[PDB]
Copies of this chain bind each other. A is one copy, B any other.
């Protein structure tokens, strides 16, 4: 039972928040489907991006921020724990100094805070996936 994609949810983050996503690539890895997760400063999709996470399935991952409309220093990883044809579970944790990205229970990517996570007002999940689960935790002070 699938959420609409692109998926937009208002959100707040601080140290101890987790964003958990469960989905499936729409097509085989040979065709290089993408997944993107963006942490935005406003509900508007043209707003700045505290954390940009983009998977080219089978190839690579890039992370960046978009600050006053401009992309900053791109970070690239060849790490590819995602499995061709499989549902994945992605969890993004706010640590004190960085985001930690777990794929199917394995630490795969981290990204030091360029902007306080308190700036985040919105998460968008989009590109070439079906989405069965999206959750932000809110238990912590």
Contact = CB atoms under 8 A, between A and B. Distances in A.
Interface of A: 6, 26-28, 30-31, 34, 38, 45-46, 69, 126-128
Contacts of A31: 38, 45-46
Interface of A is mostly: loop
A27 B128 contact: no
Contacts of A27: 6, 45, 126
The count of identical subunits is 2
Contact of A126 (B6, B26, B38, B45): B26
A45 B26 CA distance: 11
Given A127-B127, A127-B128, A46 B26 contact: no
A84 to B, nearest CB: 10
A38 B6 CA distance: 22
Contacts of A30: 46, 69
Given A6-B26, A6-B27, A126 B126 contact: no
